[PDB]
Design an enzyme around this catalytic site. Structure first.
Site, PDB file in Angstrom:
ATOM      1  N   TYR B   2      76.339  48.163  62.300  1.00 44.40           N
ATOM      2  CA  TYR B   2      76.808  46.678  61.908  1.00 44.40           C
ATOM      3  C   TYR B   2      78.319  46.539  61.846  1.00 44.40           C
ATOM      4  O   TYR B   2      79.044  46.694  60.971  1.00 44.40           O
ATOM      5  CB  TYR B   2      76.064  46.448  60.654  1.00 44.40           C
ATOM      6  CG  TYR B   2      76.369  45.172  59.937  1.00 44.40           C
ATOM      7  CD1 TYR B   2      76.074  43.905  60.663  1.00 44.40           C
ATOM      8  CD2 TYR B   2      76.689  44.940  58.526  1.00 44.40           C
ATOM      9  CE1 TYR B   2      76.421  42.652  60.063  1.00 44.40           C
ATOM     10  CE2 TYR B   2      76.983  43.708  58.243  1.00 44.40           C
ATOM     11  CZ  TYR B   2      76.763  42.829  58.782  1.00 44.40           C
ATOM     12  OH  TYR B   2      76.982  41.394  58.199  1.00 44.40           O
ATOM     13  N   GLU B  39      63.988   9.535  65.320  1.00 37.91           N
ATOM     14  CA  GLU B  39      65.303   9.750  65.333  1.00 37.91           C
ATOM     15  C   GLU B  39      66.103   8.694  66.447  1.00 37.91           C
ATOM     16  O   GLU B  39      66.826   8.160  66.184  1.00 37.91           O
ATOM     17  CB  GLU B  39      65.837  11.215  65.698  1.00 37.91           C
ATOM     18  CG  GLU B  39      65.610  12.284  64.586  1.00 37.91           C
ATOM     19  CD  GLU B  39      66.651  12.323  63.551  1.00 37.91           C
ATOM     20  OE1 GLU B  39      66.571  13.224  62.882  1.00 37.91           O
ATOM     21  OE2 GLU B  39      67.483  11.186  63.362  1.00 37.91           O
ATOM     22  N   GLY B 114      75.350  12.516  62.343  1.00 34.42           N
ATOM     23  CA  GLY B 114      75.992  12.602  63.876  1.00 34.42           C
ATOM     24  C   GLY B 114      75.058  13.783  64.434  1.00 34.42           C
ATOM     25  O   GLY B 114      75.482  14.525  65.536  1.00 34.42           O
ATOM     26  N   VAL B 115      73.860  14.000  64.037  1.00 30.61           N
ATOM     27  CA  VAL B 115      72.958  14.960  64.572  1.00 30.61           C
ATOM     28  C   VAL B 115      71.596  14.848  65.175  1.00 30.61           C
ATOM     29  O   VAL B 115      71.180  15.300  66.377  1.00 30.61           O
ATOM     30  CB  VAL B 115      72.450  15.851  63.487  1.00 30.61           C
ATOM     31  CG1 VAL B 115      71.251  16.810  63.536  1.00 30.61           C
ATOM     32  CG2 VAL B 115      73.680  16.789  63.199  1.00 30.61           C
ATOM     33  N   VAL B 117      69.981  12.475  67.707  1.00 32.91           N
ATOM     34  CA  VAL B 117      69.433  12.292  68.928  1.00 32.91           C
ATOM     35  C   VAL B 117      69.936  13.560  69.915  1.00 32.91           C
ATOM     36  O   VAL B 117      69.281  13.815  70.683  1.00 32.91           O
ATOM     37  CB  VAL B 117      70.052  10.925  69.695  1.00 32.91           C
ATOM     38  CG1 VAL B 117      71.537  11.096  69.964  1.00 32.91           C
ATOM     39  CG2 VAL B 117      69.033  10.754  71.073  1.00 32.91           C
TER      40      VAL B 117
HETATM   41  N1  LIG Z   1      70.537   3.181  70.503  1.00 29.83           N
HETATM   42  C1  LIG Z   1      71.838   3.371  70.168  1.00 29.83           C
HETATM   43  N2  LIG Z   1      72.770   2.353  70.196  1.00 29.83           N
HETATM   44  C2  LIG Z   1      73.843   2.461  70.132  1.00 29.83           C
HETATM   45  N3  LIG Z   1      74.650   3.740  69.739  1.00 29.83           N
HETATM   46  C3  LIG Z   1      73.926   4.580  69.747  1.00 29.83           C
HETATM   47  C4  LIG Z   1      72.345   4.716  69.702  1.00 29.83           C
HETATM   48  N4  LIG Z   1      71.807   5.950  69.452  1.00 29.83           N
HETATM   49  C5  LIG Z   1      72.875   6.677  69.148  1.00 29.83           C
HETATM   50  N5  LIG Z   1      74.232   5.969  69.135  1.00 29.83           N
HETATM   51  C6  LIG Z   1      75.356   6.563  68.924  1.00 29.83           C
HETATM   52  O1  LIG Z   1      75.441   7.729  68.932  1.00 29.83           O
HETATM   53  C7  LIG Z   1      75.766   8.488  67.708  1.00 29.83           C
HETATM   54  C8  LIG Z   1      75.291   9.649  67.391  1.00 29.83           C
HETATM   55  O2  LIG Z   1      73.785   9.530  67.043  1.00 29.83           O
HETATM   56  P1  LIG Z   1      73.031  10.817  66.495  1.00 29.83           P
HETATM   57  O3  LIG Z   1      73.285  12.278  66.930  1.00 29.83           O
HETATM   58  O4  LIG Z   1      71.541  10.174  66.311  1.00 29.83           O
HETATM   59  O5  LIG Z   1      73.693  10.758  65.046  1.00 29.83           O
HETATM   60  P2  LIG Z   1      73.765   9.734  63.922  1.00 29.83           P
HETATM   61  O6  LIG Z   1      72.837   8.446  64.278  1.00 29.83           O
HETATM   62  O7  LIG Z   1      75.230   9.236  63.739  1.00 29.83           O
HETATM   63  N6  LIG Z   1      73.291  10.439  62.600  1.00 29.83           N
HETATM   64  P3  LIG Z   1      72.005  11.067  62.290  1.00 29.83           P
HETATM   65  O8  LIG Z   1      70.867  10.521  63.117  1.00 29.83           O
HETATM   66  O9  LIG Z   1      71.624  10.999  60.667  1.00 29.83           O
HETATM   67  O10 LIG Z   1      72.220  12.679  62.755  1.00 29.83           O
HETATM   68  C9  LIG Z   1      75.462   7.295  66.516  1.00 29.83           C
HETATM   69  O11 LIG Z   1      76.409   7.430  65.300  1.00 29.83           O
HETATM   70  C10 LIG Z   1      75.894   6.025  67.363  1.00 29.83           C
HETATM   71  O12 LIG Z   1      77.301   5.936  67.462  1.00 29.83           O
HETATM   72  N1  LIG Z   2      77.789  40.436  51.422  1.00 28.15           N
HETATM   73  C1  LIG Z   2      77.493  40.481  52.703  1.00 28.15           C
HETATM   74  N2  LIG Z   2      77.417  41.884  53.233  1.00 28.15           N
HETATM   75  C2  LIG Z   2      77.547  41.780  54.661  1.00 28.15           C
HETATM   76  N3  LIG Z   2      77.348  41.122  55.769  1.00 28.15           N
HETATM   77  C3  LIG Z   2      77.288  39.651  55.050  1.00 28.15           C
HETATM   78  C4  LIG Z   2      77.528  39.616  53.586  1.00 28.15           C
HETATM   79  N4  LIG Z   2      77.473  38.186  53.478  1.00 28.15           N
HETATM   80  C5  LIG Z   2      77.638  37.595  54.556  1.00 28.15           C
HETATM   81  N5  LIG Z   2      77.500  38.528  55.770  1.00 28.15           N
HETATM   82  C6  LIG Z   2      77.477  38.481  57.245  1.00 28.15           C
HETATM   83  O1  LIG Z   2      77.868  36.973  57.242  1.00 28.15           O
HETATM   84  C7  LIG Z   2      76.881  36.341  58.313  1.00 28.15           C
HETATM   85  C8  LIG Z   2      77.069  34.807  57.844  1.00 28.15           C
HETATM   86  O2  LIG Z   2      76.317  34.651  56.432  1.00 28.15           O
HETATM   87  P1  LIG Z   2      76.207  33.154  56.121  1.00 28.15           P
HETATM   88  O3  LIG Z   2      76.864  31.970  56.798  1.00 28.15           O
HETATM   89  O4  LIG Z   2      75.537  33.079  54.849  1.00 28.15           O
HETATM   90  O5  LIG Z   2      74.842  32.821  56.987  1.00 28.15           O
HETATM   91  P2  LIG Z   2      73.281  33.726  57.341  1.00 28.15           P
HETATM   92  O6  LIG Z   2      73.448  34.808  56.009  1.00 28.15           O
HETATM   93  O7  LIG Z   2      73.174  34.693  58.574  1.00 28.15           O
HETATM   94  N6  LIG Z   2      72.289  32.444  57.110  1.00 28.15           N
HETATM   95  P3  LIG Z   2      72.144  31.354  56.054  1.00 28.15           P
HETATM   96  O8  LIG Z   2      72.630  32.155  54.548  1.00 28.15           O
HETATM   97  O9  LIG Z   2      70.409  31.078  55.867  1.00 28.15           O
HETATM   98  O10 LIG Z   2      72.861  30.355  56.742  1.00 28.15           O
HETATM   99  C9  LIG Z   2      75.431  36.945  57.555  1.00 28.15           C
HETATM  100  O11 LIG Z   2      74.574  36.903  58.871  1.00 28.15           O
HETATM  101  C10 LIG Z   2      75.997  38.511  57.680  1.00 28.15           C
HETATM  102  O12 LIG Z   2      76.144  39.126  58.905  1.00 28.15           O
HETATM  103  K   LIG Z   3      75.156  13.889  68.026  1.00 28.00           K
HETATM  104 MG   LIG Z   4      70.791   9.028  64.495  1.00 27.07          MG
END
Ligand SMILES: Nc1ncnc2c1ncn2[C@@H]1O[C@H](COP(=O)(O)OP(=O)(O)NP(=O)(O)O)[C@@H](O)[C@H]1O
Ligand SMILES: Nc1ncnc2c1ncn2[C@@H]1O[C@H](COP(=O)(O)OP(=O)(O)NP(=O)(O)O)[C@@H](O)[C@H]1O
Ligand SMILES: [K+]
Ligand SMILES: [Mg+2]
Ligand SMILES: [Cl-]
Ligand SMILES: [Cl-]
Ligand SMILES: [K+]
Ligand SMILES: [Mg+2]
Ligand code: NA
Ligand code: NA
Lengths: 384, 384
Positions: B2, B39, B114-115, B117
């Protein structure tokens, strides 16, 4: 003007601070605040699940920071070749980065997203990291997720482990901003039941309070503890632990003379407050198995809810790659765990009832009595 | 072993495919599958909230793909300076990238992470994007999130809008893999109530079924529709819409002679199945205001649950920066929305009761009757 300059990409940990709800939950009611501790604890529990950690120490410091020390393997310290900085820094500063995307480092782990401790770091005004590993002590400080210097060797040690201490950012957390001993204690006590052989200590430097959780007897003893202040109606706790088709299913349960249902579900030791497919599979198997028994024995109509009344159960599953609906892991959304729990419960609960006739007859009586009370309630409502 | 080689960073959209649970939810029961459509729809509804979109067309194609066409502004097409590719490609391929991290492009929007689509893209074996904007038609194809070529101009148009068509990946989605007309229709009908003046069409190319949702009368009419198959007990639906301290609060409600409680909560038009701070604030204000009225009028004991019985309500809030516990936005975790809803409800519900004495006396009677039925049920249970 809506155009390409309107589109913004959040980098590093900026997304965590911008949208803390989806990473830590409620930043005002204290649940998110304590979840910060739980993310760190879960990482230490994963070292324990892997067989490397036997002691975890959680300390609430007098300056309202919390530290978690484990005696696990230590977060890797070597330079990550692709990222070009210490693997520990990658862990702390990069979302979806970690060691739990395969089963080589942790066969089974509560961690899976590569997000948790990087969230804690992002939402902390300060974070201190100390890692003992390969004969050396390593230290690093972060402020609002930004490393102040590269991870550095500060001395030598025969020990291994990881210590994370963090001071939560009040630019994120509001209202409930102090740690509550009992919230941490509840979770750590539960973790002791779930991890026999792992010493878990909680220390409050504010008032000197401490606890040492090292229960034996596992989830069966957990059920005893949970029924302690209640009145169990039958003496033999139903318990099993199996591992089939890659999935561990461990269940303990016992009925009491009260009217509440308390089913505690866990996946890789992380609780699901909002239940999920493990809970669904448990409920389905209880209903089927009790109905089958009552049919066969001529005690038969009672529904799943009547069986629920007075029930305390713990359902603990171990899953190579579970699916949760969120970073806070309140709900298990893995359909194959429903099947595994349901199947194991149907087999072993049926056997329990055959092997423990005194308990079976008591439980049947209880279900009948619940059904009778439910019908009387219904009739009384209709008549008003 | 590890060590630093054990730490993996997931890039691009790999994290979405690795951990779909935290991005789309349940990939087996059909909820995640339909969430893919939602979405895309939510992004078009955000153009409608911004005042740019008046028609949305959702089509279930005979090859089990879904398209959503809007007549909004169109996803920006110009090269993103920092990222070096079309802003549209950044949107489709980068997590935490979009136009909703400030209020310049969308004053209020369901989108915030921003997630969305980009998740749809990541989990689709194919995605087709067509954008009408700046006098030109632009097209791009993705396969499992990978753009096949840069966004390209394919012709000219006087129109603006965005069309997204996607074919879900069966490497992610299992069991429920076909789209269900009624699941989409329920949500689109709801969106029509929530967005007066926006024409929403649903077309199923499999069987020729279609709907056109263009209800007027907003959430008051929504309450009528919801009480249609039930029996309202008083004729005047309580309704208001206010905007105070940056927060829009719109509520409609009416009691029926049944015994269920159905409160539909929304934040920026996105439903919260699991409720949240808006629901908490609604409940708190109903309980206070009814109790105050009954005290003042000498009708006074009933609890919050007795008021819940027979209630249909719609609570729709408009929030500049709300907080959800997950990408699927099932729960609002914004404490300031509790205060806003509670405050507006306390004021306006009290006024409604003063202004509509016939309705007030009926509702008081109903609450009393519910309390009487609850006590009779309790007494009947105790006596078995
Ligand atoms: N139908 C649409 N018309 C215009 N702009 C759009 C459209 N779909 C997406 N966008 C743009 O694309 C960006 C990213 O969209 P997306 O990945 O869905 O994230 P989000 O809408 O900002 N947030 P979230 O859906 O909560 O994760 C949006 O913030 C808009 O700027
Ligand atoms: N106490 C620890 N001892 C050893 N390795 C660790 C420890 N804390 C974190 N790590 C390492 O760090 C990585 C990232 O940890 P973290 O950002 O918490 O994500 P995750 O544990 O993999 N998943 P999640 O907690 O569900 O988001 C882990 O996957 C381990 O590889
Ligand atoms: K996006
Ligand atoms: Mg959206
Ligand atoms: Cl290393
Ligand atoms: Cl542009
Ligand atoms: K990480
Ligand atoms: Mg973790
Ligand atoms: Na893993
Ligand atoms: Na915004």
């Amino acid at each position: 003007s809506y155009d390409s300059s309107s589109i913004k990409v959040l980098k590093g940990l900026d997304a965590v601070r911008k949208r803390p709800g989806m990473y830590i939950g409620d930043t005002d009611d204290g649940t998110g605040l304590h979840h910060m501790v739980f993310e760190v604890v879960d990482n230490a529990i994963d070292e324990a699940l892997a067989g490397h950690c036997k002691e975890i120490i959680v300390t609430i410091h007098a300056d309202n920071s919390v530290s978690v020390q484990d005696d696990g393997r230590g977060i890797p310290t070597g330079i990550h070749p692709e990222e070009g900085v210490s693997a520990a820094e990658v862990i702390m500063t990069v979302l979806h980065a970690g060691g739990k995307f395969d089963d080589n480092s942790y066969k089974v782990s509560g961690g899976l997203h590569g997000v948790g401790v990087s969230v804690v770091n992002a939402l902390s005004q300060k974070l201190e990291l100390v890692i003992q590993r390969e004969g050396k002590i390593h230290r690093q400080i972060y402020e609002h997720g930004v490393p102040q210097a590269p991870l550095a060797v500060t001395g030598e040690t025969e020990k291994t482990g990881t210590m994370v201490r963090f001071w939560p950012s009040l630019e994120t957390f509001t209202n409930v901003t102090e740690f509550e001993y009992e919230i941490l204690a509840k979770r750590l006590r539960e973790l002791s039941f779930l991890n026999s052989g792992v010493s878990i200590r909680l220390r409050d430097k504010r008032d000197g309070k401490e606890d040492h959780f090292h229960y034996e007897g596992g989830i069966k003893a957990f059920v005893e503890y949970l029924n302690k202040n209640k009145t169990p109606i039958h003496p033999n706790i139903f318990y099993f632990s199996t591992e089939k088709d890659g999935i561990g299913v461990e269940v303990a349960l016992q009925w009491n003379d009260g009217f509440q249902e308390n089913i505690y579900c866990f996946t890789n030791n992380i609780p699901q407050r909002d239940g999920g497919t493990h809970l669904a599979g448990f409920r389905a198997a209880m209903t089927r198995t009790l109905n089958a028994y009552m049919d066969k024995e001529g005690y038969s109509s009672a529904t799943g809810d009547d069986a629920r009344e007075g029930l305390i159960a713990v359902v603990s599953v171990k899953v190579p790659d579970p699916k949760f609906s969120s970073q806070t892991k309140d709900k298990l959304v893995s359909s194959e765990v429903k099947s595994a729990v349901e199947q194991q419960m149907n087999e072993l609960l049926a056997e329990y009832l055959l092997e423990n006739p005194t308990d079976a007859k008591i439980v049947v009586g209880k279900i009948i009595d619940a059904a009778r009370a439910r019908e009387a309630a219904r009739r009384a409502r209709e008549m008003t």
